[PDB]
């Protein structure tokens, strides 16, 4: 039995980080109480929203 590394631990850590970034993005976006917080979430939605808000002003 090999003990140089814990492959199961590495996989769990990888999954953990890949989902902690997701939950961080969630936390951020509902804490803002708003959907599109930055570019890359929904570019078309962000553009149309900002354009129509300028129209509102």
């Amino acid at each position: 039995m090999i003990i140089n590394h814990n492959l199961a631990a590495i996989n769990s850590h990888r999954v953990l980080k890949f989902q902690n970034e997701e939950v961080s993005k969630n936390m951020e976006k509902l804490s803002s109480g708003m959907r599109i917080n930055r570019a890359g979430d929904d570019a078309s939605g962000l553009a149309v929203s900002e354009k129509m808000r300028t129209q509102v002003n």
Binding site: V48, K51, M52, Q55
Partner: protein
């Protein structure tokens, strides 16, 4: 009276939803410029049409 009709004309010319005019009937029965489509399905072929007439 003429003021009222020209104001209606102003409304028709200034109608705008997504930087697109609507009341001028760009999507009427005989619309040649372009066509509206509402993609309301998970597949590309699921496409629905909606028409608006000229309000001038």
């Amino acid at each position: 009276v003429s003021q009222l009709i020209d104001e209606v004309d102003r409304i028709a010319s200034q109608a705008e939803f997504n930087k697109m005019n609507l009341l001028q009937g760009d999507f009427a029965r005989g619309s040649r410029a372009t066509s509206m489509w509402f993609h309301i399905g998970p597949n590309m072929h699921q496409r629905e049409r909606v028409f608006i007439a000229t309000m001038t």
